[PDB]
Design a protein around this ligand. Structure first.
Ligand SMILES: N[C@@H](CCC(=O)O)C(=O)O
Ligand SMILES: [Ca+2]
Lengths: 351, 190
């Protein structure tokens, strides 16, 4: 009764996502007997249809899996830069980065890993066949769904900046010269075909089949770099999670190529040296301490983080409590330290 | 970017964060596949010391390279309490993902907020560069005044993130919460 905000409650299974339809797809999979991984993959495919803003088959991501028995693992299905990618590929003739090249041109794309990631996880930790978890998404793409406020808003705001500039994109998301409106029905026939072939032929359809051909051609005709060799060489990678201990609670998150796990653990290590509970939420002291701690973490991020398969990341040092203590001792609860006075830490004494 | 969480009847948990990077990515569909293409390459450092779309900077470690995976900030996360999965969370937000998830953890452990309370609470963020303490609407004027007196450069900006989380009770019951910042989302179970 003292609560202003109440959580949703369930006794058996639960799914939380940015889209009602996708969430319901996941819940149905659970009700059908699928495990968390089965449902997670089903939700991922559904979002690739109902949440084109971010749900995808043409992007990448990370998955954290923790079995009922405690086994915790990370699935890295982050995109890989094309084999033809080069260090200065986004610089203009004067040597200055061109954000257009890295955000709106065909050169902005990395080789997609989502399909590979979902199959790696489904095959090893799931229980249902790919066709069964893809089916819900397939139907949504084939038969369509009603455009809601979220999608209508994003199409009008963010979509207007890029979707109408590409023939194939405009043919799907635009209508009568305007972004699809709330209430309209969005049918994605081509995506449905792609989903159908993945369901029937497996992930190879995306990385070596017709889809791979379509991606390669899209790139070749528009100055892009992703080739069939790139797609055939893509691999999702299972990696050990980065974790820490905060006041007796263990925190698990993504390891490099993500910087998330390392800095969340690093910052928590710093905060552990302060009585956060005493200060309380929304207090100037709590915010002061956390803002300061965050500065050091982001400074370290700019120097030490990258793809572990190419560079050695000093993750042990960065998540070392003695190092965190050395940072905590620098924090003045009454005076912020300008970022100009903060540089990546010296990790030598902690590695 | 988007994040979703799942916990089944057996207690297995999954947290997934995936993305095209910016909204709709490049906005380019791959031929007749109907698949939108990501613009994840902007997550690499294009040139040492020059910020990307999220204001993040880098050098050699995160430089563009063939077959290399660009550095991400994505943080699907699980917190364990008394040896058992307790909080499953994550969120979109580029550079802000780290601090948004961090706040979910701090709110849960230090402030003892239930998953919905932790989700609906306002967020703040400092990423070193730019040197500003970014805040959402929702903090007391008295508190922001004190922060400014401490030397923080407070900047009121757009709402940050979309947490989709699940907390597991001691008896195994499930509690969940979708973010008020995102409309048409949903946390449901059975
Ligand atoms: N591309 C960003 C996430 C972007 C988003 O939140 O849209 C990263 O991997 O850290
Ligand atoms: Ca909401």
């Amino acid at each position: 009764e003292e609560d202003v905000f109440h959580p949703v409650r369930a006794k058996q299974g639960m799914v939380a996502s940015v889209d009602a339809t996708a969430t319901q797809v996941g819940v149905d999979i659970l009700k059908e007997g699928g495990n968390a991984v089965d449902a997670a993959v089903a939700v991922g495919y559904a979002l690739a249809v109902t949440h084109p803003q971010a749900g995808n088959l043409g992007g990448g991501g990370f998955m954290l899996i923790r079995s009922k028995n405690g086994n915790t693992t990370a699935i890295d299905f982050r995109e890989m830069a094309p084999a033809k990618a080069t260090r200065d590929m986004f610089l203009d003739d004067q040597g200055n980065p061109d954000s257009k090249k890295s955000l709106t041109s065909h050169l902005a794309s990395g080789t997609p890993g989502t399909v590979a990631g979902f199959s790696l996880a489904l095959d090893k930790y799931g229980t249902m066949p790919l066709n069964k978890v893809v089916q819900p998404a397939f139907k949504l793409a084939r038969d369509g769904f009603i455009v809601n406020d979220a999608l209508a808003d994003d199409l009008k705001t963010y979509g207007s900046e890029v979707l109408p500039n590409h023939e194939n994109s405009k043919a799907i998301f635009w209508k009568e010269g305007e972004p699809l409106k709330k209430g309209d029905t969005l049918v994605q026939a081509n995506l449905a075909k792609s989903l159908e072939m993945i369901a029937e032929n497996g992930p190879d359809e995306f990385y070596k089949g017709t889809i791979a051909e379509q991606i390669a051609q899209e790139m070749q005709k528009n100055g892009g770099l992703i080739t069939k060799e790139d797609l055939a060489a893509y691999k999702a990678v299972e990696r050990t999670p980065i974790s820490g201990d905060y006041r007796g609670y263990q925190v698990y998150s993504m390891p490099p190529p993500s910087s998330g796990g390392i800095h969340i653990v690093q910052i928590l290590n710093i905060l552990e040296n302060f009585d956060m509970k005493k200060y309380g939420f929304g207090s100037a002291d709590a915010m002061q301490i956390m803002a300061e701690a965050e500065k050091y973490a982001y400074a370290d991020r700019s120097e030490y983080l990258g793809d572990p398969d190419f560079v050695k990341v000093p993750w042990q040092a960065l998540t070392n409590k003695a190092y965190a203590k050395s940072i905590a001792d620098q924090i003045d609860i009454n005076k912020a330290k300008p970022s100009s006075e903060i540089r990546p830490g010296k990790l030598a004494p902690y590695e | 970017t988007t994040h979703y969480s799942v916990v089944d009847k057996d207690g297995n948990a999954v947290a997934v964060t995936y993305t095209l990077n910016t909204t709709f990515g490049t906005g380019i569909v791959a031929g007749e596949s109907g698949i939108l293409l990501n613009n994840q390459m902007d997550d690499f450092s294009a040139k040492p010391g020059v910020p990307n779309v999220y204001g993040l900077v880098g050098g050699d470690a995160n430089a563009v390279g063939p077959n290399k995976r660009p550095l991400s900030s994505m943080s699907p996360t699980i917190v364990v309490k008394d040896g058992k999965t307790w909080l499953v969370t994550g969120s979109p937000g580029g550079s802000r993902i780290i601090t948004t998830v961090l706040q979910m953890v701090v709110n849960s452990i230090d402030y003892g907020l239930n998953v919905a309370e932790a989700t609906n609470a306002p967020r703040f963020h400092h990423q070193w560069l730019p040197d500003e303490l970014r805040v959402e609407k929702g903090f007391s004027p008295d508190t922001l005044k004190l922060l400014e007196a401490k030397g923080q450069k407070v900047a009121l900006k757009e709402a940050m993130g979309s947490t989709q989380s699940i907390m597991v009770g001691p008896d195994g019951e499930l509690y969940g919460a979708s973010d008020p910042r995102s409309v048409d989302d949903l946390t449901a179970g059975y």
